[PDB]
Design a protein around this ligand. Structure first.
Ligand SMILES: [Mg+2]
Ligand SMILES: [Mg+2]
Ligand SMILES: [Mg+2]
Ligand SMILES: [Mg+2]
Ligand SMILES: [Mg+2]
Ligand SMILES: [Mg+2]
Ligand SMILES: [Mg+2]
Ligand SMILES: [Mg+2]
Ligand SMILES: [Mg+2]
Ligand SMILES: [Mg+2]
Ligand SMILES: [Mg+2]
Ligand SMILES: [Mg+2]
Ligand SMILES: [Mg+2]
Ligand SMILES: [Mg+2]
Ligand SMILES: [Mg+2]
Ligand SMILES: [Mg+2]
Ligand SMILES: [Mg+2]
Ligand SMILES: [Mg+2]
Ligand SMILES: [Mg+2]
Ligand SMILES: [Mg+2]
Ligand SMILES: [Mg+2]
Ligand SMILES: [Mg+2]
Lengths: 52, 52, 134, 187, 104, 147, 128, 125
RNA sequence: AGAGGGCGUGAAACCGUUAAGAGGUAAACGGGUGGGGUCCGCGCAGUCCGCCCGGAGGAUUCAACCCGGCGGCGGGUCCGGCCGUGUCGGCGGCCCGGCGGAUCUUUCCCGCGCGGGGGACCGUCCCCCGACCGGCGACCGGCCGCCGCCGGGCGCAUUUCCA
RNA sequence: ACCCACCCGACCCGUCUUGAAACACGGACCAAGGAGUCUAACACGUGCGCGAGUCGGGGGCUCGCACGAAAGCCGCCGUGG
RNA sequence: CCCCGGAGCCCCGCGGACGCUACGCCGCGACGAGUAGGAGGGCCGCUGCGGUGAGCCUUGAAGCCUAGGGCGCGGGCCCGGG
């Protein structure tokens, strides 16, 4: 049927918690290599570049 | 409050200049992959077209 | 990617618009690139092929350096027949083996006024595009 | 053939927390090691109450924490709760505290840190007192949930004070035959 | 790649395969943790790495762009339980083990 | 997740968890709440008392706008007002006695549950409880009506 | 000479025949894969005398010799050359197994790399 | 720290490999290739890795520096040992012994180093 | 065409032929074996080697030990500086910082008793040097101990490879 | 693991039943399809976030929608449950 | 009346696995029937999706046949030939 419960809404605080955990594990290169990103020449893993 | 290091800002050719920004506490937020997987697999169902 | 929501980008719909295209769209689909001398002389990347254009065969079992005139352009099967691109049957008669125009390079065009104005329009569009990119 | 009644051979207690949360699993590992190494029973009770579920570790309130810590003898004492510390807005004054918990809410945390107390975690509690000396282990209201008001003796039965499952309370949904002496019978 | 303003970075990192662009205030969970796996290689800018503090703040400061949101608290702070168990404050109180394997 | 439901562990089992002797028929005891006084009477007596019968008067055009009377206790009374108001209390050599407007906070009647701290107040509410008024006048406050 | 394992135990097996399904001899649609009888009156289910036997937990092989080849190794399915350095510290107890979908061009490279790394392959002479 | 990211990595890492009852781990600086808490070089503060040389003769030894986290380009230092193989085993043994540099990886790194030594020679006739 | 105009691959039920085995308790099955076949793994002996040591054949270099350079680990009176948290000092930023308040002031201003901007007050976030406790894995520059790498002096009782 | 030979055992599966190998029923054989799903109301148990609060429904503001009819935000952050 | 960069020991309070996917490894003791039914584990199987394997592939994918080698108690799975 078309009226299946297709969509799921999550709590806003849970969505903010999960996105803060994702931003926190965007650091920690042991979690980045275990994801599978080749990292071997990256000078600093919180890679912040200019505003240019 | 936890420890916050000082991340450098790289230029357009590598070659890190004298600009240094303190790391936010968002990167020191706790990691819970069960919450990340919960929120991911519940928000992933929202861009899903119906079939009948 | 494509951003226009009116462009199709669908598998079966693009196969439908390809294999059920009318003749004036089949003429544009059956276009072939030009040789490097013709590209340097006209600044034209590709052109649709005509009844009596001169053709080198680029890929296939009939690959070679022989410049062969097109016998005829058969737009139903999306194919062209060239002079020396033929094959003997069992009964000894020679039948021209068709080559798809994507594996076909043009060495000499058969120039008329319509082809001259098409190449001038395409060269003007390339000039406007190069000026916009410059 | 031996006559063991095998109905109760498998003890149904918790061996591990059913949750997959990794901070709680690290706290579980640390208190596993403290339970099977230290001779104290405090670490065993802390491990057993880290095993339990969310409806089984009840939230403990700040005014009940003040009440149970202003008992005589427990000066210089810490309060170890294996659930959550919730704030009560109906208490006015709060003394110095030393509260160990899994999670303290923001209002209770601000109230304790404004009163001048200390809020430790369980790893800091293990670094402070590994055997559990100077501790009082507390727990919130276990029967305090609304779910226990429907349990026990059945309604429609004399000397029973069980809340029945009513979709909407009012005048004409109940309090008729079965509750009135005029309509047949009451209980 | 996380960008702050649109001045051509979205047009630039557009046909290079693999790069997903995210705005600072419009961060997406489905692109910061694809497939449920939490780690992701991210390239920040200066005005993104400075605006994260204006998005979520520290523990002793509010979000300052959101209405009511503080950072969450850790269930345990020091997660280096190897260092915790090899610290002398616990091993002074620990007893002697029983590791002699007594077989049948 | 149909991967984790019970119908996967019942593949190969004949009666599918619903009994061999008494089969899973369509409606063995009627549809819905069938049989109130008959054959479900023991269930409707020992689990739903008061379900059958009329009681009380009938108010035909009822509306919650007339009977809307939200209640607040004296135990949560300083919660409606900011904390610096009770920081700046028992001072200034005056008997400062701040005003707690209850209708401004969103309640009408002030009830008398709980302990009230020793500080004079001016509670402005539409209705009062007698026990609440006794606690307020015992602390040293004043109950002011408002419409 | 061949590649010898670390230890060579005597692999004992409680049963080496297959647990065939009931009436698979009679019917062609009934495969040899085991299905437990769940009938009210079934000879195999209530275990009469001299029939097919049901697979119980009692036929379990020893944990030291479980999943063990008759040569003394344990199989590990290997697709490419990079997966051969996985078994570099396990060559005395584990052996490589080249997959079916691996072409004959790099199969020779996998065989010569395992010969350099002293890892036994149970099928080196297959394609050539 | 380390146990936290081990609790993350232990089941959903890209280098994890199941398939036929053994769970290995295929990242660099994982000698003995186990999916264990002892043998994992990405997580820990101190990391010993043993690899064959790119030229084909010698063994490179990888040491984690400790001088900077969050910086994978300068996180490791590589050295090359191409000697008469007894000095190779003794040099790697002294690296892991005298520097107090995580002595649990010591004998296993000796195993992997001397297995690479037997790898870099003509094996058959 | 081992793709031949209902033609991509072409299973099972069923049929034909060839090869093998068998045949009077209908056929078929389980347990235990034996015999005959089709293939697999050896083998003109497979005794397989992995270490340490002794002996007779060979041999290029280097380790032992010093010199110069580079990189790494550990650390002291914490050596000097950044960095970093808990308290104290200047209440200093408070106006040379924004916010919020159900604390006052219309001693003020503007738009007409109201709203905003001022003025104090409170709460939340920061500046400078100095002390103590944990210098805390958040970083360096010198100093010491140790380890590894490169180039020489190291000519042969040392050193390592083939049999 | 293919076939044959011997000794002992061994009645044809599913179902209704107190009882089936049944002179009880369905059943020549084979291939494909084929039967506990979805919405709502609840009840209990469990996982997560916040906590005397919680939730944003609905709506509105940002991107022109490839990824999107996703995501982010709200003196509507509480009208309301 | 001395330190174990080493007393040299069936025990090393000096750092301390070969043994540690701590959701792991190891050591004892008891038990093992089962319909209707209930619960748990599946590195049993099918299909599609988000990640992941610098995955496989015309130097041969899926499917199919097999008198071959096997593994798992089993569901089934991995190779060898066409
Ligand atoms: Mg039993
Ligand atoms: Mg039981
Ligand atoms: Mg059953
Ligand atoms: Mg039935
Ligand atoms: Mg049932
Ligand atoms: Mg029934
Ligand atoms: Mg029976
Ligand atoms: Mg064909
Ligand atoms: Mg086809
Ligand atoms: Mg085809
Ligand atoms: Mg055919
Ligand atoms: Mg009947
Ligand atoms: Mg019965
Ligand atoms: Mg009968
Ligand atoms: Mg029967
Ligand atoms: Mg009869
Ligand atoms: Mg009948
Ligand atoms: Mg019939
Ligand atoms: Mg089927
Ligand atoms: Mg029920
Ligand atoms: Mg619940
Ligand atoms: Mg309602």
């Amino acid at each position: 049927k078309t009226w299946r419960r297709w969509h799921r809404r999550v709590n806003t605080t849970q969505k903010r918690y999960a996105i803060c955990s994702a931003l926190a594990a965007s650091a920690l290169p042991a979690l980045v290599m275990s994801k599978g990103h080749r990292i071997e020449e990256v000078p600093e893993l919180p890679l912040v570049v200019e505003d240019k | 409050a936890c420890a916050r290091p000082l991340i450098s800002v790289y230029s357009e050719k590598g070659e890190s200049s004298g600009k240094n920004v303190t790391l936010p506490a968002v990167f020191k937020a706790p990691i819970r992959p069960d919450i990340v997987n919960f929120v991911h697999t519940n928000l992933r169902k929202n861009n899903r077209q119906p079939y009948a | 990617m494509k951003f226009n929501p009116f462009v199709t980008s669908d598998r079966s719909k693009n196969r439908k618009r390809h294999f059920n295209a009318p003749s004036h769209i089949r003429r544009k689909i059956m276009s072939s690139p030009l040789s490097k001398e013709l590209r340097q002389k006209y600044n034209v990347r590709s052109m649709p092929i005509r009844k009596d254009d001169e053709v080198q065969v680029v890929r296939g079992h009939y690959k070679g350096q022989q410049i062969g005139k097109v016998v005829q352009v058969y737009r139903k099967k999306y194919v062209i027949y060239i002079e020396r691109v033929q094959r003997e049957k069992a009964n000894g008669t020679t039948v021209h083996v068709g080559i798809h125009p994507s594996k076909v390079v043009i060495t000499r065009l058969k120039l008329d006024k319509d082809r001259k104005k098409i190449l001038e329009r395409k060269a003007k569009s390339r000039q406007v595009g190069k000026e916009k990119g410059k | 053939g031996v006559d063991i009644r095998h109905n109760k051979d498998r003890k149904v207690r918790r061996k591990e927390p059913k949750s997959q949360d990794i901070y709680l699993r690290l706290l579980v590992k640390l208190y596993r090691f403290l339970a099977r190494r230290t001779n104290s029973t405090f670490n065993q009770v802390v491990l057993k109450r880290l095993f339990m579920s969310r409806t089984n570790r009840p939230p403990l309130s700040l005014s009940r924490m003040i009440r149970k810590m202003k008992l005589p003898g427990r000066e210089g004492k810490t309060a170890v709760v294996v659930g959550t510390i919730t704030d009560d807005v109906r208490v006015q004054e709060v003394p110095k505290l030393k509260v160990c918990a899994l999670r303290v809410s923001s209002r209770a945390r601000s109230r304790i840190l404004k009163a001048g107390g200390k809020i430790l975690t369980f790893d800091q509690l293990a670094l402070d007192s590994p055997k559990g000396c100077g501790t009082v282990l507390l727990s919130g209201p276990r029967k305090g949930r609304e779910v226990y008001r429907h349990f026990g003796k059945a309604p429609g039965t004399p000397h029973s004070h069980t809340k029945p499952y009513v979709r909407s309370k009012g005048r004409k949904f109940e309090r008729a035959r079965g509750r009135r002496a005029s309509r047949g019978y009451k209980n | 790649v996380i960008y702050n303003e649109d001045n051509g970075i979205v047009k630039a990192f557009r046909n290079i395969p693999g790069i997903t662009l995210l705005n600072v205030t419009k961060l997406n969970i489905l692109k910061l943790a694809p497939g449920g796996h939490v780690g992701r290689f991210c390239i920040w800018t200066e005005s993104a790495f400075r605006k994260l503090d204006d998005l979520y703040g520290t523990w002793r400061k509010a979000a300052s762009l959101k209405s009511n949101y503080n950072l969450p608290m850790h269930k345990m702070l020091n997660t280096d339980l190897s260092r915790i168990l090899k610290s002398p404050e616990i091993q002074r109180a620990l007893r002697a083990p029983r590791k002699k394997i007594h077989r049948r | 997740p149909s991967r984790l439901r019970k119908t996967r562990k019942l593949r190969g089992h004949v009666s599918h968890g619903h009994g061999r002797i008494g089969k899973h028929r369509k409606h063995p005891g009627g549809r819905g709440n069938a049989g109130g006084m008959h054959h479900h009477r023991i269930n409707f007596d020992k689990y739903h008392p008061g379900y059958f019968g009329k009681v009380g008067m009938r108010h035909y055009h009822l509306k919650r706008n007339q009977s809307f009377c939200p209640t607040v206790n004296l135990d949560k009374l300083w919660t409606l007002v900011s904390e610096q108001t009770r920081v700046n209390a028992a001072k200034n050599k005056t008997g400062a006695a701040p005003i707690i407007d209850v209708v401004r906070s969103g309640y009408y009647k002030v009830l008398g549950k709980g302990k009230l701290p020793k500080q004079p107040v001016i509670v402005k509410a539409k209705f009062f409880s007698r026990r609440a008024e006794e606690k307020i006048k015992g602390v040293g406050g004043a109950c002011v009506l408002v419409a | 000479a061949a590649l010898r394992p670390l230890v060579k135990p005597k692999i004992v097996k409680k049963r080496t025949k297959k647990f065939i399904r009931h009436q698979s001899d009679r019917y062609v649609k009934i495969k040899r894969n085991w299905r437990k009888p769940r009938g009210i009156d079934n000879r195999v289910r209530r275990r009469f005398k001299g029939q097919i036997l049901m697979p119980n937990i009692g036929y379990g092989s020893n944990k030291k010799t479980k999943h063990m080849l008759p040569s003394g190794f344990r199989k590990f399915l290997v697709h490419n050359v990079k997966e051969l350095e996985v078994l570099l510290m396990c060559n005395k107890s584990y052996c490589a197994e080249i997959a079916h979908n691996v072409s004959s061009k790099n199969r020779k490279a996998i065989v010569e790399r395992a010969a350099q790394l002293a890892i036994r392959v149970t099928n080196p002479n297959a394609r050539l | 720290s380390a146990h936290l990211q081990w609790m993350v990595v232990r089941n959903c890492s890209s280098f994890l490999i199941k398939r036929n009852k053994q769970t290995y781990s295929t990242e660099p600086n994982n000698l003995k290739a186990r999916n264990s808490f002892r043998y994992n070089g990405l997580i820990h503060r101190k990391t010993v890795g043993v690899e064959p040389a790119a030229d084909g003769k010698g063994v490179v030894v990888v040491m984690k520096r400790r001088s900077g986290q969050r910086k994978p380009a300068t996180s490791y230092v590589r050295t090359t040992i191409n000697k008469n193989a007894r000095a190779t085993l003794s040099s790697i043994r002294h690296m892991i012994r005298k520097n107090k540099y995580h002595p649990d990886l010591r004998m296993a790194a000796i195993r992997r180093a001397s297995a690479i030594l037997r790898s870099q020679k003509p094996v058959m006739v």
